[PDB]
Design a protein around this ligand. Structure first.
Ligand SMILES: *[C@@H]1O[C@H](CO)[C@@H](O[C@@H]2O[C@H](CO)[C@@H](O)[C@H](O)[C@H]2NC(C)=O)[C@H](O)[C@H]1NC(C)=O
Ligand SMILES: *[C@@H]1O[C@H](CO)[C@@H](O)[C@H](O)[C@H]1NC(C)=O
Ligand SMILES: *[C@@H]1O[C@H](CO)[C@@H](O)[C@H](O)[C@H]1NC(C)=O
Ligand SMILES: *[C@@H]1O[C@H](CO)[C@@H](O)[C@H](O)[C@H]1NC(C)=O
Ligand SMILES: *[C@@H]1O[C@H](CO)[C@@H](O)[C@H](O)[C@H]1NC(C)=O
Ligand SMILES: *[C@@H]1O[C@H](CO)[C@@H](O)[C@H](O)[C@H]1NC(C)=O
Ligand SMILES: *[C@@H]1O[C@H](CO)[C@@H](O)[C@H](O)[C@H]1NC(C)=O
Ligand SMILES: [Cl-]
Length: 527
């Protein structure tokens, strides 16, 4: 019988057979009181104790959220839809332990993405069993509330202060601190890693004083708080919570009466009004996300970064080659998952209007002219590849390098990667390239399972990424092996070297998309 005694009770888990060995899994440990009724929109309250045995034998409920129904039956979009029931009773976490039981194992804590509106830790691409099995690390993942039930903000008001989902993550990091030693983990060697909004969450934990002692190192994939989509000013966050009160019929004179009104609304009526809090409408919009709440985030994040008020430790940061293409099928004219998506100059600027609704006509012309110095003046794909890299550079690559520059300037070693391999099983068309989110299955080692049609090059590369990630967690350096491996050098503001990841060849490059990023850093803020 598999049983472990936490500080709030005792949990029992399962034995899983992985690659001829076994990994012990505990699925769905509650880490907070279910934020129901009076506790909706509040910070997570601590659990007390159970005096029984909690069968942590199945993934728990996912937090209430809207579902991506744009392409019914399509694996490419539904692999991100939650695969458990939805409920506000959703603050649970998962723990993967290598067998035989370790003694001081390093812990990887995964924070999922999904624009702070969607996501769950029970997805197949977040399965921590191979990381536990292949690198002998403990993997932890939690669910945190998303949408308005996680980030509705009346700044200063404890009934709905903002950033509740971030506090959900933080209290799960407190659970790891308090209980992971009972599983064989080292509380003093914990590495947070995540993707997109999860990577942005990780970067925010680097700023929040309440998280300073709850982890050791950080890995950020396709995300950081300085991204345009990552943070809403507290002034704008308050307008949208009152707009959503208007859509619900909850507009009152006192703030606490407004919150009392939305606490008795059915969860499905809150989700159904979330998309309207803003006129529109980027497929990248975050209607309810992190804000300056004066508690988890005491000031605008770019200020505390510039002022050096963040945790000083090693970070690992990187992006994919075609971050932008995933978002053009969600509204840009002429783009389709079933077409080759060749678009015209006109469709390109109308695509710009979709992603840049509040930018002047001069500003849209400058973007266009910076991305139309064709190499083959008469290549059709020119305009559709250009707009993908506009979305990609602006929303991910340039903010990620700007974060790593400014972070590295305070004396800690930073490592930057560029993920260039497209999955051989990727269900999206070839024109979409190496998409946002499709490095995750290589980070979690899914290509190491030789029975899901992956190529041998892909298992080699995934096994390398798994090792570099685990070694950076253990040692603060993503060294793969001492010999017969490409050394991964530190990102510095001077040379800005980064390591590229693909099956063909891992080489060392410099100044990634420097000419494109110079436009978004030093010209675009002036239009
Ligand atoms: C480079 O990675 C290697 C592993 O590939 C680390 O080497 C050591 O690994 C053994 C286990 O085989 C441990 O007993 C040692 O303690 C490890 N070394 C250290 C310094 O702890 C090594 O840590 C990495 N080296 C650097 C400089 O990052
Ligand atoms: C895993 O399964 C059960 C746990 O209840 C136990 O009998 C068994 O010894 C465990 N380990 C292995 C290697 O099967
Ligand atoms: C699951 O837990 C219940 C009580 O919550 C217990 O009665 C049952 O035996 C457990 N399942 C097992 C041990 O397989
Ligand atoms: C785990 O490692 C830490 C330092 O990383 C050490 O202080 C602690 O005593 C270790 N715990 C063990 C070996 O049980
Ligand atoms: C607040 O929201 C409404 C949406 O109905 C909008 O008309 C108004 O301009 C907003 N005020 C802001 C964003 O300052
Ligand atoms: C395919 O491309 C055309 C070209 O404009 C576009 O209008 C259409 O929406 C795309 N998708 C389908 C299913 O036709
Ligand atoms: C690819 O298909 C399945 C993957 O689920 C696997 O069982 C099979 O052996 C692989 N190879 C071939 C030739 O089908
Ligand atoms: Cl400091």
């Amino acid at each position: 019988d598999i049983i472990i005694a936490t500080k709030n009770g005792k949990v029992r888990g399962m034995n899983l057979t992985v690659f001829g060995g076994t990994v012990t899994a505990f699925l769905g440990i509650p880490y907070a009181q279910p934020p129901l009724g009076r506790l909706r929109f509040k910070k997570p309250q601590s659990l007390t104790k159970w005096s029984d045995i909690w069968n942590a034998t199945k993934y728990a409920n996912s937090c209430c959220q809207n579902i991506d129904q744009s392409f019914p039956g399509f694996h490419g979009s539904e692999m991100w839809n939650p695969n458990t029931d939805l409920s506000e009773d959703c603050l649970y976490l998962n723990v993967w332990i290598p067998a035989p039981k370790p003694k001081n194992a390093t812990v990887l804590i995964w924070i999922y993405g999904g624009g702070f509106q969607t996501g769950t830790s029970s997805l197949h691409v977040y399965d921590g069993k191979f990381l536990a099995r292949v690198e002998r690390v403990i993997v932890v993942s939690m669910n945190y509330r998303v949408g308005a039930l996680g980030f509705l903000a009346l700044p200063g008001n404890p009934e709905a202060p903002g950033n509740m989902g971030l506090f959900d993550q933080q209290l799960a990091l407190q659970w790891v601190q308090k209980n992971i030693a009972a599983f064989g983990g080292n509380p003093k060697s914990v590495t947070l890693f995540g993707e997109s909004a999860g990577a942005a969450s990780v970067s925010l934990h680097l700023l929040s004083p309440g998280s300073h002692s709850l982890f050791t190192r950080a890995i950020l994939q396709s995300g950081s708080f300085n991204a345009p989509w990552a943070v809403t000013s507290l002034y704008e966050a308050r307008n949208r919570t009152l707009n959503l009160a208007k859509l619900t019929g909850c507009s009152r004179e006192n703030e606490t009466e407004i919150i009392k009104c939305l606490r008795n609304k059915d969860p499905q009526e809150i989700l159904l009004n979330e998309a309207f809090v803003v006129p529109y409408g980027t497929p990248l919009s975050v209607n309810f996300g992190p804000t300056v709440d004066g508690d988890f985030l005491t000031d605008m994040p770019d200020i505390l970064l510039e002022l050096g008020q963040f945790k000083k430790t090693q970070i690992l940061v990187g992006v994919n080659k075609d971050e932008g293409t995933a978002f053009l099928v969600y509204g840009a004219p002429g783009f389709s998952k079933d077409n080759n998506s060749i678009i015209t100059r006109k469709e390109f600027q109308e695509g710009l209007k979709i992603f840049f609704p509040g930018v002047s006509e001069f500003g849209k012309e400058s973007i266009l002219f910076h991305y139309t110095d064709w190499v083959d003046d008469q290549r059709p794909e020119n305009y559709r590849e250009a707009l993908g890299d506009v979305v990609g550079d602006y929303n991910f690559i340039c903010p990620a390098l700007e974060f790593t520059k400014k972070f590295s300037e305070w004396g800690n070693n930073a490592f930057f990667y560029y993920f260039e391999h497209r999955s051989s099983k990727l269900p999206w068309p070839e024109w979409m390239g190496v998409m946002h989110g499709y490095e995750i299955e290589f980070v979690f080692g899914l290509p190491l399972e030789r029975r899901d049609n992956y190529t041998k090059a892909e298992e080699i590369l995934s096994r390398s990424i798994v090792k570099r990630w685990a070694n950076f967690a253990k040692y603060g350096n993503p060294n793969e092996t001492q010999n017969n491996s490409t050394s991964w050098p530190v990102f510095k503001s001077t040379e800005q070297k980064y390591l590229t990841l693909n099956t063909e060849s891992t080489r060392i490059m410099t100044k990634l998309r420097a000419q494109q990023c110079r436009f978004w850093t030093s010209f675009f803020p002036k239009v």
